[PDB]
């Protein structure tokens, strides 16, 4: 009869999940709901652009500060090219994943029901053309993010503690 913070998934005890503060806190749930992957109404291309931008931007750093040429004068260029190559490989990964997973002309099988039960429209990211647009946007955004990180770090040479 106590408070009992922990609850079953949407009140259903026979679904394989739980309601924890980590899962569905108002702050955590708000944060996850507004991530580009979970903005179902937005076109897949723009979500892919945002995801690729973020991922290339964060990927530039490790290659630059850990690559084999980190002690040379081409450290920045080598790291940026390594990040771009990883982005390209992941673009091939996304393309083949979409080819294998989705077939042209089929409806989306993503969950179209909210926790409350609003029964919204199915997400178009889980479609052949949706995933193709997502992959193209991710490629463009990844290259853009790598270029932006290289420009900020080296072409413009903003003052940063570690680089």
């Amino acid at each position: 009869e106590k408070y009992q913070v922990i609850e079953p998934l949407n009140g259903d005890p026979f679904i394989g999940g739980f309601e924890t503060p980590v899962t569905s806190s108002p702050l955590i749930a708000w944060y996850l709901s507004n991530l580009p992957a979970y903005r179902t109404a937005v076109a897949p291309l723009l979500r892919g652009v945002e995801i690729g931008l973020a991922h290339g931007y964060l990927l530039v750093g490790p290659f630059v500060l850990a690559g084999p040429l980190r002690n040379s004068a081409v450290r920045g260029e080598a790291g940026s090219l390594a990040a771009a190559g990883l982005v390209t490989i992941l673009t091939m990964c996304l393309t083949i994943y979409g080819i294998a997973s989705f077939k042209e002309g089929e409806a989306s099988k993503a969950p179209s029901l909210t926790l409350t039960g609003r029964q919204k429209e199915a997400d178009k990211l889980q479609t052949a053309e949706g995933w193709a647009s997502f992959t193209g946007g991710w490629f463009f955004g990844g290259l853009s993010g790598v270029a932006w990180a290289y420009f900020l770090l080296y072409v413009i040479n903003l003052p940063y503690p570690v680089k």
């Binding site: 949407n10 899962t23 903005r39 993503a110 029901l113 039960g117």
Partner: peptide, 26 residues
Amino acid sequence: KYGEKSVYFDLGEIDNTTGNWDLYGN
């Protein structure tokens, strides 16, 4: 109904019955 009582099985609402929910799909 899914939420009228302690029943959690409903053929009219199979997505609710099987747990096919979208937790963070804004």
